[PDB]
Structure 1
């Protein structure tokens, strides 16, 4: 048991597209979205 080191160092290697790459990765896990019934409020 250690309490003297910082264990949140992964973010020192994050880059420009890290957040959106993870969002792309999560895309296969989502439930299908609900539908308002039309393509947009202007349709």
Structure 2
């Protein structure tokens, strides 16, 4: 049923302070390996 009268963006009422960081932690398993610059730090 098509409905143009309600607001469907209601999930942000239930977001906590750590929602972004837990989402990033869950996303960390899907990521590709990062490239390396060949050194630990520019001060190394």
Whichever structure has more helix as a proportion of its residues is 1
CA deviations over 1:5-42 (Å, ceiling 9, x no partner): 00000010001100000000000000000000000000
Runs of 4+ displaced beyond 6 Å: none
RMSD (Å) for aligned C-alpha atoms: 0.3
The runs of 5 or more residues in structure 2 that have no matched partner are: none
The runs of 5 or more residues in structure 1 that have no matched partner are: none
TM-score, with length taken from structure 2 = 0.95
Number of positions where the alignment pairs a residue of Structure 1 with one of Structure 2: 43
